[PDB]
Protein: Ribonuclease VapC4
Organism: Pyrococcus horikoshii OT3
Amino acid sequence: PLPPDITFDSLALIKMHSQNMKRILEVTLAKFTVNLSIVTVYRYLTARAYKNIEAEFEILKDIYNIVPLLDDIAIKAAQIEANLIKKEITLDMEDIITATTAIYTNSLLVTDDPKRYEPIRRFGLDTMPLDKFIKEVELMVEKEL
Amino acid sequence: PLPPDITFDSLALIKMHSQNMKRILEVTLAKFTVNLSIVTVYRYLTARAYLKKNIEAEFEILKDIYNIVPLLDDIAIKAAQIEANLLDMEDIITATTAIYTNSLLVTDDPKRYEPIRRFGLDTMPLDKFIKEVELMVEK
Ligand SMILES: [Zn+2]
């Protein structure tokens, strides 16, 4: 079926947490534990702003487990990022911390662009395409009838 | 023109930890409070990891001398506000953390943070910072 722990990157989260996708989000939150890095949250807030950002952030803190950039995350990310730099692979800081935080929390990373995280999978990251995730929740919605 | 609270971005922090800079860092740690963003710490650890140093230990060494500032709620909120008006994430968080802590941001490249100045950031090029500290050495 699907693991109980998941996460999103900022672009995927902007999609999931829209007014538009309300129904799909409601089911996702009823069924899964969602562990977001604080860096994902901040990037989501940047999109939601462009506001009463403050009130939006209180909503998010209620409904998601917001994971700080912990020392062990910084450490593990520095190790991963040193490997990626070794291969001339450029992912920005957001992507590295997002991926390391998913490794840390054993959360499946749902993203519209799994391919760019592919080189991190060797450090324990797993990913799922967002279109596929959405399709799976859409079936649950149908099934509720 | 140095205040009691200062911070560095990651390239500056790396330079600060070089052997030739040991005196400058010693004065800085003795006479100022240095408030680093966790993101700056992560980038610095990246540099040390790329050179195969003991990352765990180095983190503990840093935690013992710096005030390491998490990406706090208020920092996340303020940073999003800044980024939405206007630079990568490291730059935004570094600067927002500087604003939050009221630390002077000491950097190799002040000009890239020039757009955050409207939200209250103060910056200083590292070259000038070092001169000011050189002066304190003469004591
Ligand atoms: Zn944090």
Summary: The interface with chain B takes residues 38-39, 41-43, 45-50, 53-54, 57, 61, 68-69, 71, 74-75, 77-79, 81-82, 85-86, 92-94, 97 of chain A (CB under 8 Å). Chain A has one domain: 1-145.
